[PDB]
Design a protein around this ligand. Structure first.
Ligand SMILES: [K+]
Ligand SMILES: [K+]
Ligand SMILES: [K+]
Ligand SMILES: [K+]
Lengths: 292, 292, 292, 292
């Protein structure tokens, strides 16, 4: 539910750019079959940026329905206005979702005090477990360990998706929070390293197309079998890197379509279709992972 | 008007975070009297992030009404979803605004081709002049001179607010675009340098509280009187820097309240009240500028 | 000899700026008593920058003499001219030193091919074991894992001091080199993390003044007792950070003098004496480590 | 002379890496004929890093001799040990050089106070004009405008080569120093911008192969004819960039050989020969500049 291989699942779309139920069902069946631990619905990889809150909610509810209790579902609930974050979270109160993934406000670059008040207010308006999400390269701000420690004192703030790729954050956060506070990687290429340092799992883009390998890798890591996990990691490393050859989720949607997991690789503007060079790069990575 | 001193105006709020018409009137009267070239309504400094589109539109309409033809108004129209940008833009068609200030999508980090398709589509569906807005520190993406050059070929894409603070961009862009394309600094501390290199004006935070000095500085710059402009710039430099001592528009709103231009310095979360240290810093800068 | 807690030992000086033998002897006795694994003589912390090659060699030979076979000594041999690196290394051929620490050329920013040819040529002119040293913040260049792998194929290139503080390098290098290639941290604040990921020890500044704790921490790490090691790390973390409050080795020399380990904290220009604020910061860190 | 186009001249070498007098003569004759303002002898581009001080001095003396009073010569005198800088400077006292170009210490990352004491001591022990040289990408430290202002008060500290490429530095420094203090760009690609902002000249790599165009460009810039200067700059821009496609001076030495200005393009390790791809890139840039 908040450990192991968690997929930041794509929102598959028809050619008109609306959610494709047949494709979503196929994806969710795949994750259940693959041993994926949970699904993050309408996170970054799910095109939270270009779905309105009604559409977002429709996808989350559809994902929950189709999951049919077989696999836990975490809703993306991020917003750069605290009022909007609260409103979006309230949509899922008493819904069946097991928790929320909520990103530091983007664009407006709040202070560490602002981040504290933001997440505290959100937490106060829900009984749902909250996973903080830090990704400075996308947001323009950086939720530092000290503030994470402050926020971990709030009862329902229970973990962090740390997407900096800065591995020193693992033990910096760990020393300031209780032993049951969950540390999850948001950076596929460093996620095994992140678990080797004490992290409890990954919210993963790669898991969209290598769900089985990712589940296996994280199980091995949790068991302390890092050399064995590393063999899998090495097979997946080109995907971990090349799934960001063009902006996420352009490559991973293409990959999903290539593997027959979704009907179309359609995205919403300003995401654009994969370049020819992109296709070949990603195809090479899939081949390296043994997925073709 | 798209040259000279253009204020990125604060959205003054009462204690409930709602727009304060009386305060907005005072500000607009102040800019009319002080020679400001135009008003950017609900840009970053106007808390675009935390107003919903309906509130956003209300503020722009209120600003047009209060302006009453005395000073041109430019609407902030940025969104990270191309469909949303287009929809927001339509709310202002035939409103009386003279143009739109439209930011590169934030958080989703589109490619250069993505940015091209975003702004092209926005421009296609309006007759209004469009001013592009690049601010990588906030958005996570960087609209490069090559792509600005492509976009400048679109009839109604007329200029750019360049907020990198990287002065090499001025002549990189200038050489790729027609001589009527407007280059506006979005970085107060480097704006005079930007104008000296070929820039046509500034969309300014400092202009909120030093409107007359900014207007004169920009006129002198336009006339080639850089040494004379620089004397004014030097007295404003502490403001140019310290208005960002805490997240914009926290400092400038406090400054406006201290001068009596607005009734309260209230903001919306995740912006929080200025710190005591911040007040001291900002106060000092106002005094250096001769404003208190 | 190339694992555990290795000290990048200061070059203690009299008030005239020349090596102080009495102080060097006291330091070396301290390291023997403390269980320090080896001594790096005239590395960065030893003011390699401001000693000429004759003076450098005198200090290395004095350190070797005073060690008297009780503790292995690694000579700093870095130079940004390959001819000079070769000449400096040749001074120590058949001397008693057990190996060399050789930094990527600084200032002239060679290519990865240049780095390869540099280190290959050096290795070819000596039988001594070579430890590569990467510290981009000081040198302006970055020896990447791929090139490390290339160089590890040379018989006497046997390890790396990785001072980037970028923990992802550990497993990137490890996968490209043989199992007996040594990975050492050059970044005290992340060194435990570095060992947790597979590193074999640290070449440490902190060990100058906390030799016992550092030895104990590294032993615990090598044994897989990371929680226990972490308790020591937490006690030392303020030193790990604050020993760079002013340029290394200004703080650590002051610390050594304060602990009675050296007679004077004299350095050579352009290093300047510790500031008053500096003194208090470092004193607080020593107190936190229980060393006062 | 400390204004206009100043060439950072290559140290031409035979196949053994020894200075080639015949090639150096050709280069000097070329700069005399092409209107270059002065020659910087054994700066970065002259492989200061890989000549020992005696060879360094030989090249400077040979350059004075060949110049034969026809063009002023500035000696590179930088060292990261203040005592060494002073000693090197004395080798040139009463030599006929008109001044020294002295870099911020590299690798040891001194404080601003350290830099102050370094350059003050150097200036004290010579009558020669000193030009400070700031290039953080290479040295690991950054001489800030405040400290430049302090140093400019020293009689014989007369100017600065500012190689950051950060154009805001021009007027930050200018406002802190007297009107006779010389501001010289050390970044070819931004040099015209630097001059437009108030800079007095450039210490240039590009001038090695486009001496006449550089001399005219700088004269036009000095006269305020920026649009006319910019046309020349645009034909040189590919060289300004691609002369750093591989580490300086690898590209410019190859370019000199291709034009027939020098007999061989040999460098000293850790510089290695230009790649085939590099040749292609550089060749293209020469052609764009009209030189081949
Ligand atoms: K909690
Ligand atoms: K246009
Ligand atoms: K080896
Ligand atoms: K002076």
């Amino acid at each position: 539910m908040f450990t192991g291989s968690i997929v930041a699942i794509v929102t598959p779309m028809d050619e008109k750019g609306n959610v494709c139920r047949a494709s979503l069902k196929k994806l969710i069946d795949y994750h259940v079959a693959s041993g994926t631990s949970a699904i993050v619905s309408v996170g970054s990889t799910g095109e939270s940026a270009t779905l309105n809150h009604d559409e977002h909610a429709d996808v989350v509810m559809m994902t929950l329905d189709l999951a049919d209790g077989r696999i836990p579902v975490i809703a993306g609930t991020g917003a750069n206005a605290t009022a909007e974050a609260i409103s979006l979270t309230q949509r899922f109160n008493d819904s069946g979702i097991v928790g929320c993934l909520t990103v530091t406000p983007y664009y407006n670059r709040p202070s560490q005090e602002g981040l504290y008040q933001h997440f505290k207010a959100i937490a106060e308006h829900t009984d749902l477990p909250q996973i903080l999400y830090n990704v400075p390269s996308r947001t323009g701000c950086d939720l530092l360990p000290e503030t994470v420690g402050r926020l971990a004192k709030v009862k329902n703030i229970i973990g962090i998706k740390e997407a900096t790729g800065n591995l020193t954050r693992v033990n910096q956060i760990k020393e300031l929070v209780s032993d049951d506070f969950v540390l999850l990687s948001g950076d596929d290429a460093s996620a095994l390293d992140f678990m080797q340092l004490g992290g409890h799992g990954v919210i993963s883009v790669t898991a969209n197309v290598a769900a089985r390998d990712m589940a296996q890798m994280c199980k091995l890591a949790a068991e302390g079998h890092f050399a064995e996990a590393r063999v899998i990691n090495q097979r997946l490393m080109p995907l971990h890197n090349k799934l960001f050859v063009e902006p996420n989720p352009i490559p991973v949607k293409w990959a999903c379509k290539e593997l027959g997991l979704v009907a179309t690789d359609t995205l919403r503007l300003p995401m654009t279709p994969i370049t020819d060079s992109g296709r070949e790069t990603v195809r090479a990575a899939l081949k390296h992972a043994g997925l073709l």
